Amino acid sequence: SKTKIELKDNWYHLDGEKYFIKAIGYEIGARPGQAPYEDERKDELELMKFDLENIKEGGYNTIRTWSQYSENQLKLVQESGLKLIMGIDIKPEEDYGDPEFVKDSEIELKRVLNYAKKYDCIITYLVINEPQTDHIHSVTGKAFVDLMNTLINIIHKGHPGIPVTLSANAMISDYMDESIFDVYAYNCYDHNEGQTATMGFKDYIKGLNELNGLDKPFITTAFGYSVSPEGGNGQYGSNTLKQQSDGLISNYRDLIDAGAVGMCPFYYADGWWKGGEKSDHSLNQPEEWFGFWGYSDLNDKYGTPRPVWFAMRDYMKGLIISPKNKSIHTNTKIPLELYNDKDVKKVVVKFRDKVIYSKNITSEGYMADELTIDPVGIEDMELAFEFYDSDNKIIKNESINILASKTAFELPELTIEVTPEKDLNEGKIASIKTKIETSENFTLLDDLKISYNTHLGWAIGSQASVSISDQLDKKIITSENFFNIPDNCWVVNASAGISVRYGKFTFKIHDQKIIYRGDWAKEVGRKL
Numbered sequence: 001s002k003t004k005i006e007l008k009d010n011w012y013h014l015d016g017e018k019y020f021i022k023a024i025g026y027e028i029g030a031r032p033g034q035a036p037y038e039d040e041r042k043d044e045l046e047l048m049k050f051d052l053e054n055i056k057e058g059g060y061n062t063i064r065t066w067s068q069y070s071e072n073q074l075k076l077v078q079e080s081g082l083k084l085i086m087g088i089d090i091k092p093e094e095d096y097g098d099p100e101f102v103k104d105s106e107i108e109l110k111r112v113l114n115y116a117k118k119y120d121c122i123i124t125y126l127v128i129n130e131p132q133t134d135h136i137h138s139v140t141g142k143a144f145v146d147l148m149n150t151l152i153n154i155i156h157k158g159h160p161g162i163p164v165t166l167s168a169n170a171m172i173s174d175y176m177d178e179s180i181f182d183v184y185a186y187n188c189y190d191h192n193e194g195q196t197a198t199m200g201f202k203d204y205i206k207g208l209n210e211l212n213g214l215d216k217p218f219i220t221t222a223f224g225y226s227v228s229p230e231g232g233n234g235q236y237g238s239n240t241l242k243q244q245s246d247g248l249i250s251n252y253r254d255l256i257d258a259g260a261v262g263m264c265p266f267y268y269a270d271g272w273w274k275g276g277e278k279s280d281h282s283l284n285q286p287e288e289w290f291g292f293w294g295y296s297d298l299n300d301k302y303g304t305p306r307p308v309w310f311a312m313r314d315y316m317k318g319l320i321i322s323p324k325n326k327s328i329h330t331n332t333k334i335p336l337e338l339y340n341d342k343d344v345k346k347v348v349v350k351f352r353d354k355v356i357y358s359k360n361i362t363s364e365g366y367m368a369d370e371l372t373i374d375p376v377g378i379e380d381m382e383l384a385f386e387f388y389d390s391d392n393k394i395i396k397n398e399s400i401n402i403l404a405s406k407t408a409f410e411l412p413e414l415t416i417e418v419t420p421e422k423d424l425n426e427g428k429i430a431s432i433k434t435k436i437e438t439s440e441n442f443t444l445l446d447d448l449k450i451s452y453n454t455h456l457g458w459a460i461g462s463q464a465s466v467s468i469s470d471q472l473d474k475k476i477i478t479s480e481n482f483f484n485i486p487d488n489c490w491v492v493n494a495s496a497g498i499s500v501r502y503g504k505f506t507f508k509i510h511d512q513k514i515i516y517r518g519d520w521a522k523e524v525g526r527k528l
């Protein structure tokens with residue numbers, strides 16, 4: 001009598017009902033003094049009970065993991081009521097083409113499935129975490145793609161009806177074909193650099209979903225901020241607790257706006273192990289301070305929640321999927337899509353302090369309806385949503401900003417032409433020629449940003465800020481920027497973008513090219 005999972009209209013459905021995955025990343029075996037990949041493996045059931053209870057009280061309906069649970073650990077999750085997105089420990093730096101590696105991975109996965117298939121709390125498998133561009137280049141995309149297929153197929157037979165995808169960072173694996181998987185997924189971070197500086201976070205991830213083809217559900221397997229005392233660069237590491245909390249909420253809205261119907265904020269609690277020494281909480285390792293919970297000292301096995309925990313719990317009470325923030329509408333009818341928890345009994349939408357939508361909610365979960373708006377010409381509109389509880393008291397406010405008209409209209413447009421256009425082998429030097437078709441009434445703000453992300457490990461590559469002050473009054477605004485191509489660049493994401501404003505509506509216009517060195521990515525690269 002197990003949960004039927006159906007993927008359609010780019011949503012997960014459980015037992016016929018659309019189901020927004022409100023997950024959180026969760027790693028057991030990562031208390032101070034512990035390292036989950038090196039220590040003798042323990043079930044840690046007492047600490048899991050504490051954690052699973054905390055996570056239910058934090059508002060989540062799902063956990064997301066990196067490493068397979070034992071049967072004992074799975075049964076506890078099963079009995080908790082939470083859903084599980086279970087990662088499999090398939091070492092990313094290993095040779096995917098090595099028959100011993102393949103066989104060990106297959107034997108291990110089959111061992112897991114043999115009991116895991118009894119536990120219907122599992123709603124997705126993640127078959128690998130974070131394969132690096134250069135490594136794939138080195139062992140070949142075919143080795144990679146063949147391994148993914150092998151494991152996908154073993155899961156489809158061993159635990160039927162459960163979707164399979166992977167954990168892949170959007171900043172380094174933008175180029176990758178994800179069409180072999182059942183759902184599209186990225187780890188998504190907003191550090192306002194490279195792709196996220198040009199396109200902005202919303203538009204970057206949405207672009208990838210469009211390139212993917214808008215034909216499967218899309219989820220995020222990670223996002224968030226580190227509150228390390230120091231270390232990192234820009235917004236990576238070294239955030240305040242307030243920055244962390246405000247950042248998760250900005251991320252949550254943005255990624256919904258990119259089409260996500262499942263969310264795995266990163267993550268439950270700090271892992272001191274992650275910067276190298278598990279017994280020490282290093283002041284300058286961003287990676288050891290990503291938790292929504294932190295530990296006081298080496299002996300603290302429990303920890304306490306940081307402000308982000310409470311902001312997230314509050315934010316998740318009522319989710320707005322449509323309309324989307326920074327969306328453009330040319331109809332008077334706007335799709336409304338909500339995912340309410342059981343405490344939301346009424347939703348109101350206001351424009352300029354006037355009710356345009358009111359509805360008593362009698363059942364939790366997904367609901368669709370339509371908003372009627374009445375824009376004059378091209379009208380920027382802050383849509384003020386209000387969620388109320390059973391006592392008619394507001395428990396959440398959220399704005400959705402739209403740009404609306406009853407009639408089709410012109411936006412300013414940014415396109416790029418990139419050289420080499422199609423094959424990096426054709427020269428040692430690149431160019432990005434940007435062209436902005438302006439539109440009066442739309443103000444271009446600040447600097448044009450250019451990114452030539454050559455994908456060398458985590459490094460962003462060259463960027464450039466170009467002033468367009470001297471050109472603001474022209475219909476067509478141009479720029480040409482040059483970049484040296486590293487010999488070990490196998491793929492590049494070349495992009496450009498600028499901020500635009502219409503009344504109080506601010507957004508970005510941008511364009512993007514993904515360009516490969518040779519035919520190395522015939523198998524692994526996205527086919528359009």
Ligand SMILES: OC[C@H]1O[C@@H](O[C@@H]2[C@@H](O)[C@H](O[C@@H]3[C@@H](O)[C@H](O)O[C@H](CO)[C@H]3O)O[C@H](CO)[C@H]2O)[C@H](O)[C@@H](O)[C@@H]1O
Nearest residue numbers: 027066067087088089090091092129187222266271287
């Ligand atoms: O089980 C698979 C794999 O796990 C690795 O350890 C993982 C980390 O890779 C992971 O890293 C996070 C990213 O997935 C996410 O996108 O961003 C955050 C912030 O930058 C990263 O920390 O974190 C989890 C949880 O601590 C770890 O379990 C192993 O290193 C690897 O050997 C193993 O195959």
Ligand SMILES: OC[C@H]1O[C@@H](O)[C@H](O)[C@@H](O)[C@@H]1O
Nearest residue numbers: 169171189191236287458459
């Ligand atoms: O410096 C390396 C780090 O850079 C960040 O942008 C990534 O999100 C991290 O996962 C990575 O380990």
